[PDB]
Amino acid sequence: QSMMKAVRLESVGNISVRNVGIPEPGPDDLLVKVEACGICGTDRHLLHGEFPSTPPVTLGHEFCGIVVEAGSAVRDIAPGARITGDPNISCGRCPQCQAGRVNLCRNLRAIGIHRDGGFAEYVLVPRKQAFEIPLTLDPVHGAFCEPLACCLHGVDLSGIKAGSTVAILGGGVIGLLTVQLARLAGATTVILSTRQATKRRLAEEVGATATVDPSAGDVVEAIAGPVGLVPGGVDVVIECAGVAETVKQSTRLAKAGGTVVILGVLPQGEKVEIEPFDILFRELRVLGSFINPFVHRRAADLVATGAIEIDRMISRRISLDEAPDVISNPAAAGEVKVLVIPS
């Protein structure tokens, strides 16, 4: 019996590396030897039971790798191909799916959450979830397709286009990837707000036209105020931090007729005040953005053509053995994206 290492969430709070069997693909599965799998903030929430999962389960939903076996019914992608996985499996039979809102599937199952995922030497990927990418690519770049796709969906919803002005709240990987996508989509002012000096510097290396530090003063005044960067406000505000203060400020950062996108996850049940008078009289849009419907191929293409800076987003590369400790502890100060490299 051939074995592999895998980072298993045994039950809420209980995570460790175990030896498990190398899985055997069903007729429509690919078996993929993982080249890299990113750690997400969602993985820490999964560990602590703050998002639901189906333990015992191998975590990891931001992965790419080389196909080593194809199921009998797969004629399309052969061993040797590189793929990135879309972890989100929609059912195709519920009212959300039948209306094309596959991200809102009522029966959604996610690789790395309800099914064994990418923090392992090998992972099963149903054919429909596999997106081929070039073999000439850096082996780890494919791991960014999922987070890029989530950000690209948010940028699509925002209406960013040539000449837009944009404020991005939060200096995590989501904020930084959204800086890059804002510029690619045509925004000519892209401002990132974060208290972390290291993240402001990185934002400017990857396309931010300016950055602001919320410690130095009121961000609403610094951006949208009379002597701010963009007096009267920006076209588009994308809240990426999932923090109450910045969700609250987002509408006041937007110009009249502007758009706020809620891309960051604030804790369930937590409440924030809006002013309905202002939303109406300044004709604002407030839009939720959820995961990656119909954007994984575009994201994979952007990675394939080198349109996005990926290397600067990688703060650390770790082994499977190191993953449980990194996931069990809070994100480090200079952490952008940690990649788990199974070998």
Contact call for residue 313 and Cl ion (CB under 5 A): no
Map residues 60-99 to x or -, x wherever contact with Zn ion holds by CB under 5 A: ------------------------------xx--x--x--
Q: How far is the CB of 241 from Cl ion (least distance, A)?
A: 5
Out of 9, 57, 149, 174, point to the residue binding Cl ion (CB under 5 A): 174
Map residues 221-260 to x or -, x wherever contact with Cl ion holds by CB under 5 A: -------------------x--------------------
97 annotated to a ligand binding site:
yes
Q: How far is the CB of 90 from Zn ion (least distance, A)?
A: 5
Secondary structure E strands in the chain: 3-11, 14-21, 29-38, 57-58, 63-70, 82-85, 88-89, 109-110, 122-126, 130-133, 165-169, 189-193, 210-212, 234-239, 254-262, 285-288, 314-318, 337-340
Q: How far is the CB of 93 from Zn ion (least distance, A)?
A: 6
| Pairing label, strands 29-38, 285-288 | unpaired
Written as six digits, the tokens of 269 are 């049940």
Contact call for residue 170 and Cl ion (CB under 5 A): yes
Output the DSSP codes for 48-74: TTSS---SSEE---SEEEEEEEE-TT-
Do 68 and 32 form a contact (C-beta atoms < 8 A)?
yes
Question: Which does residue 97 bind out of Cl ion, Zn ion, none, counting CB within 5 to 8 angstroms by kind?
Answer: Zn ion
Output the CA torsion 102→58→70→152 (10° steps). 40
Contact call for residue 147 and Cl ion (CB under 5 A): no
Per CB under 5 A, residues contacting Zn ion are 90-91, 94, 97, 105, 107
Question: Per the annotation, where are the binding residues for NADP(+)?
Answer: 174, 194-196, 199, 245, 263, 265, 289, 291
